[PDB]
């Protein structure tokens, strides 16, 4: 016989290997596939799909539909943001339950940009202006309008256009960031403030809500396949 030599690694079973084994049912007519709409090629594609963020996970509002309703109430112009959010995926309970986050809990790194879209859900007649602000990684949470004003911010007008889209760029030290809580690689903050205030005509309800969405971009990628499934 052809002189062959068995090297180390024979008779072992690598779960992640890729070998050609015997086919149990020879000549079996496999039913041909049809173009059923919605074929998926890669997971990153499901991320580029905007998904509503449950912002208000308060004691009573969490695990209820109210977690998705950010309400602009009738309170004083205090530079206390209406909402603030940490750009730290699994290291923050809010970005975690999004389809975006659901993809990130299966990897170790994440790169690229992300986009937060705010949709106003108030009376047509109602008008006002708000300031959506972004504070790059490592920087302290912008707690005042003036503070938040200095950095990357969009001045979103309610009166004119109903939906704001703020694309958070790639201002990161490491070429690949931690999906985990790390100070070496920590997200940043996305917060909203009252640029102006809310103006409502006649006797139209003085309290409406805003929804939030999050998704990935074409440059968004992931690595090192891991898991977390319990019993």
């Amino acid at each position, epitope marked *: 016989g052809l002189p062959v030599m068995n090297t180390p690694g024979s008779n072992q079973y690598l779960t992640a290997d890729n070998f050609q084994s015997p086919c149990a049912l020879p000549e079996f007519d496999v039913t041909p596939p049809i173009d059923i709409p919605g074929e998926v090629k890669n997971m990153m594609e499901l991320a580029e799909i905007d998904t509503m963020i449950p*912002f*208000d*996970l*308060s*004691a*009573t*509002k*969490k695990n209820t539909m109210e977690m998705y309703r*950010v*309400r602009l*109430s009738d309170k*004083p112009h*205090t530079d*206390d*943001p*209406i*909402l*603030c*959010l*940490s750009l730290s995926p699994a290291s*923050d*309970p*809010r970005l975690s339950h999004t389809m975006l986050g659901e993809i990130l809990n299966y990897y170790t790194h994440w790169a690229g940009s992300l986009k937060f879209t705010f949709l106003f859900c108030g009376s047509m007649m109602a008008t006002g202006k708000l300031l959506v602000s972004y504070a790059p990684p490592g920087a302290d*949470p912008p*707690k005042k309008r003036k503070e938040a004003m200095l950095g990357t911010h969009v001045i979103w007008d309610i009166g004119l256009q109903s939906s704001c889209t703020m694309v958070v760029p790639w201002i990161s030290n490491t070429t690949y960031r931690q999906t985990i*809580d790390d*100070s070496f690689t920590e997200g940043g*903050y996305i917060s909203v403030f009252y640029q102006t205030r809310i103006v409502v005509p006649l006797s139209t309800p003085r309290e409406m809500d805003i929804l939030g969405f999050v998704s990935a971009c074409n440059d968004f990628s992931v690595r090192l396949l891991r898991d977390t499934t319990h019993i």
Partner: nanobody
Amino acid sequence: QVQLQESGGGSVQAGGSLTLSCAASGYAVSRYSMGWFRQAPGKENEGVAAIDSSGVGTTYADSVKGRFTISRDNAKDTVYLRMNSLKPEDTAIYYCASGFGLSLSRYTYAYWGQGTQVTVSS
């Protein structure tokens, strides 16, 4: 998993001082702030007091201003809400939450306690 154990509740008198506390597990208390939210029977999520562990910069609600005192402990990872001089309006099931930080807003937080019932008995 981050845990906040709302401890210091009960039915005291009108003017009766009652301190509150919360054990902050899962993170370095300095990276976060900490505040308080009360909700009267069948009412809404309303703020009371909150301060940032690093800057220790105070902030109270207008109605509670004066009588309530917030103070943080970086050693025991606990907050102390000295609800002094209580009133029948202060009868609201309290809650504590770690902030990003810093101030009393709609929600603006993430980790929420179970809920301790304080009743300003009169």
